[PDB]
Design a protein around this ligand. Structure first.
Ligand SMILES: [K+]
Ligand SMILES: [K+]
Ligand SMILES: [K+]
Ligand SMILES: [Mg+2]
Ligand SMILES: [Mg+2]
Ligand SMILES: [Mg+2]
Ligand SMILES: [Mg+2]
Ligand SMILES: [Mg+2]
Ligand SMILES: [Mg+2]
Ligand SMILES: [Mg+2]
Lengths: 80, 81, 122, 135, 87
RNA sequence: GACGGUAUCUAACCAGAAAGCCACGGCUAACUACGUGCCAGCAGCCGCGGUAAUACGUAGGUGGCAAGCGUUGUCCGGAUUUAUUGGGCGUAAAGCGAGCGCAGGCGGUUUCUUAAGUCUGAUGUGAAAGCCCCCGGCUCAACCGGGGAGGGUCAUUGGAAACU
RNA sequence: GAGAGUUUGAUCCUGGCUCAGGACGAACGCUGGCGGCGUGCCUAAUACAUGCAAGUCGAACGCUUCUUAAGAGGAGUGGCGGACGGGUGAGUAACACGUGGGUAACCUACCCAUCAGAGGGGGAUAACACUUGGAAACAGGUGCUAAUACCGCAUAACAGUUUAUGCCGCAUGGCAUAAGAGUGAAAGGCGCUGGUGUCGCUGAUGGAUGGACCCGCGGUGCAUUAGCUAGUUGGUGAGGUAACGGCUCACCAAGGCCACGAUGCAUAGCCGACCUGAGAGGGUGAUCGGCCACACUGGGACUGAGACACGGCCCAGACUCCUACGGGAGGCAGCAGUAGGGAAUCUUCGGCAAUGGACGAAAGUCUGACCGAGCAAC
């Protein structure tokens, strides 16, 4: 009622964008996990793309830096 | 130097569990109205690193973060079999 | 094709939950009713904290039927249950809120308040 | 008692209670339960007005009224004074207090409150019995 | 924000104030951490009491007064000392 | 500067516009008259009333309070009437009908030891407001403000260990 | 730390009843002059007619209307606030509260201090113009357009991680240095004369502030309630959260709680404090302050530093309202106020002058918080 309509609209748009970007991050990560299961040599670049998405999601307020660190650490233990 | 987290001394009552035990303290509060020195057998769960402690054995335990739902305490010693 | 001893669900918050047709109104030997036809009935199951309660004799209106209704243009409506609405002597209802859908055939019979209170009118 | 006994079971006091349980309860029509409320006065509807014979050392016609309260407890009260405007279905206000003559009257009726008319031609102890000044 | 403001006391039409260290989230009269003086204009001039050490410590630690408290601390010389200590 | 042309101050005037409530047998301070006649009614308890009522009702008078008074309802106290402080069990209430014994409660003298209980020093905290003490401003007072004090079967550390 | 009356023909014990005092958010009755200060739905967390309570920024951005290119007004996008303030106490017998502690298992927009940096690019979108939707709120379609909106590209890790040492701690471990590998940032506006100052922008630390979790102890009745639990108890992994951990899943084992009262039932917000009392204690939890919980009932998430959000979203249910009958809309336990219930407890008032809060560079706008006034001999 009281100027909350605008926050409804902006919050829905934010929902769209943030869920899209998190899904992007998760697809990158899942792709890397399947690559580590398949043993292909693309693992080296997929690792870096996953880390890239993780930190770029730590930016823009999707991911808390501790969650980013835990993700990077899990991926590191997978790769190494 | 930093703080020191609470420590208690007690006695074991069960060691049927892996990496953990139960420990009993046995203070004696005075009943609030009638003043009699009552027993008070508070007990706790302690993380044993190696399943060392034995039943009916004196022990010391220091608090720490929750290691389980029950656990809040860390084994330190084994004193009297 | 709603008859005596025929049981009906209730499509309002009047207090009743299940109904039993005592008789059909209109004429002398009417042995059958459909949408828009008024009913005399009992109450076999009522909501506990309800106005209308067990045993009460009351009039009612058939609002949706399996043996459904027909339109001039050959378009026919049918339903998966037989339900009715309790009313007073006037065509107005006892309760305040009708549930489920409702046929358009009632607008000719001047149950306009029920048509309005219903969410969907087919 | 020994102190061990007094710890195993402590002193549990002599339970107390009121001289007017009818005033210490209420009623909500929604959940339909006795709501415990400490109310000095109440409203009621006289379901009967009559006379009763008091105990042995006394002898008289004591005017009572059986009353239906707001909280749906039915209560016998006394009509103090000399004269009353009361009938069956007459709204009335009730206060506490025994009438030592009859046992079954734990309550009194108040004058000058509601349909109860003020006492007529009472000039002394006048607030009691509820009648305005003679100017 | 952490702030150094003044809370209301005394009867109506005869006010009085305590300078106080309050978050902006707390009420006018509610949570506070420290009191560092008090105030009333009911005298012909204004009248003031202060605790220089503690108020200057909170200002250093990051406090942010209101306008009237800034005026008072100016009259008492605390803002100048804080400025000097930052220089 | 909403309050507000309010507080407040000045001057003119009128004793003139401004007191009632309860009780008066004893517990409880406060007494007679008339009517009534176990009726009317009173009543916190004891109890008054049946032709001479300081107990009903009225009048007069007095007493206690006073812009309040009285009444009900609730809480505490008196109530040692749930007795830790601080009660009892022959006859008043109460010793199970009596025993065997698990658990618990209690436990002879004494060396050494500990220090859970206990005692004790210091430190911290126990917000403010409030109770209390000293101050100060509202024509005093309530109230308001300042300062202080105290408050924990409280916590850490450090000793004794007589007693359990 | 005062007692008195009352059992008896009388007496003493025992034992109960009542009274003498103090206090109400009080009510009823009778009476009633004023002033000051405070308090005022304890019941139906019952339903809500009406009005007002959270907006703000043109010095972030582009339009539109009126100004002879000036300022002022309308709707945009964007940011910040809306999670505070205010109300109520239903649920909750438990780390909810109080107190004492811990977090080497943590987070923190705004405010401070410090180290740094702020480069070059892109594609859209509202608004707006037409279109259909017809009562019109709604809503959809085509096209154009700006931003401190959004995207990704350039560099830094001072962040985190692993190695090697050193140091220390209470085991896990923590601090300092160096190295390795990989990753990521941004925004400009105003003013001065490319240099700028101010406000903002991005990373890292530290502090403050508030928040989250964990533990000792404590505070209510029933045993005419004696057994309770099965992700329940623990462990090895994995996942997950700001973070610990059955928080979650699988797997292994069968343990774990309790007569020191578990479990269940009822009751209840807790506390500072308030009334009483010689004290020990009892009773209460109104006003003021603190913590908690709730927002028609139930659930779930999004946004955001912060909610699982009184005056936000979705869904289910109950309840009501306006419709042109096609479809919409709402949630006073915010301040006043209505009805009902009740023994019963307020004006449908003024102002932001103060004090405090949001926003803003600032004036200033908003503010039923709050200031005041009003009614009631409470
Ligand atoms: K008399
Ligand atoms: K509650
Ligand atoms: K709920
Ligand atoms: Mg006398
Ligand atoms: Mg009398
Ligand atoms: Mg006589
Ligand atoms: Mg006997
Ligand atoms: Mg204090
Ligand atoms: Mg006493
Ligand atoms: Mg609301």
């Amino acid at each position: 009622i009281e100027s909350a309509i605008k926050r409804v609209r902006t919050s829905a748009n934010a929902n769209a964008k943030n869920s899209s970007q998190t899904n992007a991050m998760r697809t990158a990560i899942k792709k890397f996990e399947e690559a580590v299961a398949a043993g292909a040599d693309n693992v080296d670049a997929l690792y870096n793309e996953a880390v890239k998405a993780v930190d770029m999601a730590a930016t823009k307020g999707l991911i808390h830096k501790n969650k980013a660190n835990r993700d990077k650490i899990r991926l590191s233990k997978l790769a190494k | 130097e930093r703080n020191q987290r609470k420590v208690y001394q007690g006695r074991v009552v069960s060691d049927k569990m892996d990496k953990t035990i139960t420990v009993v303290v046995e203070t004696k509060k005075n009943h609030p109205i009638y003043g009699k020195r009552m027993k008070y057998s508070k007990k706790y769960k302690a993380h044993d690193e190696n399943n060392t402690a034995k039943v009916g054995d004196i022990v010391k335990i220091m608090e720490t973060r929750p290691l389980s739902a029950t656990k809040r305490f860390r084994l330190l010693e084994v004193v009297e079999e | 094709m709603i008859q005596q001893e025929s049981r009906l669900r209730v499509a309002d918050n009047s207090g009743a939950r299940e109904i039993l047709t005592i008789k059909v109104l209109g004429g002398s030997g009417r042995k059958t009713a459909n949408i828009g036809d008024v009913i005399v009935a009992t109450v076999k199951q009522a909501t506990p904290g309800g106005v209308v309660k067990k045993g009460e004799v009351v009039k009612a209106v058939i609002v949706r039927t399996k043996s459904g209704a027909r339109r001039a243009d050959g378009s026919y409506i049918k339903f998966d249950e037989n339900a009715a609405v309790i009313i007073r002597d006037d065509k107005s209802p006892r309760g305040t809120r009708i549930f489920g859908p409702v046929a358009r055939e009632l607008r000719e019979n001047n149950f306009m308040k029920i048509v309005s209170l219903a969410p969907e009118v087919l | 008692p020994t102190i061990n006994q007094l710890v195993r079971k402590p002193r549990k006091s002599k339970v107390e209670k009121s001289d007017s349980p009818a005033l210490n309860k209420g009623y909500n029509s929604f959940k339909k339960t006795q709501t415990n409320v400490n109310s000095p006065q109440k409203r009621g509807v006289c379901t009967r007005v009559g006379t009763m014979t008091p105990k042995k050392p006394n002898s008289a016609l004591r005017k009572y009224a059986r009353v239906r309260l707001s909280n749906l407890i039915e209560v016998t009260a006394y009509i103090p004074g000399i004269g009353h405007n009361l009938q069956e279905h007459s709204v009335v206000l009730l206060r506490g207090g025994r009438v030592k003559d009859l046992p079954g009257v734990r309550y009194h009726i108040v004058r000058g409150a509601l349909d109860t008319a003020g006492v007529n031609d009472r000039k002394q102890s006048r607030s009691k019995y509820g009648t305005k000044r003679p100017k | 924000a952490v702030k150094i403001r003044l809370k209301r006391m005394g009867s109506k039409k005869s006010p009085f104030y305590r300078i106080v260290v309050a978050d902006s989230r707390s009420p006018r009269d509610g949570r506070f951490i420290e009191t560092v003086g008090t105030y009333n204009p009911l005298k012909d001039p204004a009248e003031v009491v202060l605790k220089e050490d503690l108020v200057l410590d909170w200002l250093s630690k990051g406090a942010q007064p209101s306008d009237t408290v800034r005026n008072i601390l100016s009259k008492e010389g605390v803002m100048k000392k804080h400025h000097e200590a930052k220089n």
